[PDB]
């Protein structure tokens, strides 16, 4: 909407809101991130204090697929099957039939332990487990299964 810009409101003003003592000239200190260590050092120190330097080891060819590991906490496990199934198997214990949560089928590899689980037995099938994740699943009456 060019009719809502500031240019339409500054017609008749000589400098178009840019100053008379200091004009609107071509440059204001260099093109791009110029002068990162001479006259814009106070900008990089103030707002990007670790911009210049090196840190860590180079990975010549990083295989980004080997670091892929989606995570889900324990409190969010039941949302995979919904509250309808959760209430159905609310009154189960050892011996009878218990729902299985397939984290891998939903795209989750590692199960972390955060928050609180409902007080029902459940079987959790996944690729990795945290120490506190297995504790919270076992403390509620469930079992942990590995995959892949």
């Amino acid at each position: 909407a060019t009719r809502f810009r500031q240019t339409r409101r500054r017609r008749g003003h000589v400098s178009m809101g840019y100053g008379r003592i200091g004009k609107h000239r071509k440059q204001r200190g260099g093109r791009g991130n110029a002068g990162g260590q001479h006259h814009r050092k106070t900008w990089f120190t103030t707002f990007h204090p670790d911009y210049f330097g090196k840190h860590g080891m180079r990975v010549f060819h990083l295989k980004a697929n080997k670091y892929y590991c989606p995570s889900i906490n324990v409190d969010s496990l039941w949302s995979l099957v919904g509250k309808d199934v959760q209430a159905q198997y609310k009154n189960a214990k050892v011996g009878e039939e218990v729902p299985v949560i397939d984290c891998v089928k939903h795209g989750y590899f590692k199960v972390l332990g955060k928050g609180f689980l409902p007080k029902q037995p459940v079987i959790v099938r996944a690729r990795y487990f945290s120490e506190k994740a297995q504790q919270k699943i076992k403390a509620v009456g469930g079992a942990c299964e590995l995959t892949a």
């Binding site: 697929n65 729902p99 469930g142 942990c144």
Partner: protein
């Protein structure tokens, strides 16, 4: 935020606009229709395997591959020379990855071969194959008796190749065979019985024992040479 914009080169000669996009649909769709009218079996997008994706990030998913291996055709009792003529993709470059891949893609070929209806090479009713079917039809009936029996009672040498299903039927023209034979059955909610042993299985220790075993092979080799 520090800006990283790569417009210092002459981007104006690098700009590609998509004004032809609404007309690619019309071109491709019309050509796709034209091929179907020419020889409708051709556009069927010949059957393809069910192969897993690569890497652990995707390895639980199935996707159509290119071509059945020569071992999968043998398992399904199809000649590799006749396979290409009846809309089957064949990829000799594919090494058989596993027994499960061999079995799963053997069902795909067998299921496709049951839905297949090959028309006679010559439309005349005097074609040799149609005549040949009549000549040995009496042998088929007695053959179909004993096969129907030891199947009905039971429930190492087999035919090398099966027969091509050849007959005369109405032309029900289906634009592709991959969408008729699904890769994966719909997934229901799996559910299991909780046992005492299941409650006792410690998953974390198994993960760390498996990991720490792999990281102690160096300690084994280093101490060996000493």
């Amino acid at each position: 935020a520090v800006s990283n914009i790569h417009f210092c080169k002459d981007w104006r000669s690098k700009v590609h606009t998509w004004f032809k996009q609404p007309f690619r649909k019309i071109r491709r769709h019309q050509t796709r229709v034209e091929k179907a009218k020419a020889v409708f079996p051709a556009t069927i997008k010949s059957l393809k395997p069910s192969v897993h994706c690569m890497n652990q990030r995707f390895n639980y998913k199935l996707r159509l591959g290119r071509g059945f291996t020569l071992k999968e055709l043998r398992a399904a009792k199809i000649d590799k020379n006749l396979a290409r003529t009846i809309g089957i993709a064949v990829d000799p470059r594919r090494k058989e990855s596993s027994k499960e891949c061999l079995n799963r893609n053997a069902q795909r070929l067998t299921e496709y071969m049951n839905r297949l209806v090959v028309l006679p090479k010559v439309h005349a009713a005097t074609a040799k194959r149609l005549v040949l079917n009549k000549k040995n039809a009496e042998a088929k009936t007695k053959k179909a008796a004993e096969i129907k029996k030891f199947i009905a009672e039971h429930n190492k040498k087999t035919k090398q190749f099966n027969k091509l299903p050849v007959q005369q039927k109405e032309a029900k023209q289906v634009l592709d065979a991959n969408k008729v034979i699904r890769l994966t059955a719909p997934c229901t909610l799996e559910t299991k019985t909780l046992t005492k042993g299941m409650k006792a299985f410690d998953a974390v220790a198994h993960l760390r024992k498996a990991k720490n075993v792999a990281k102690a092979v160096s300690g084994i080799v280093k101490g060996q040479k000493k």
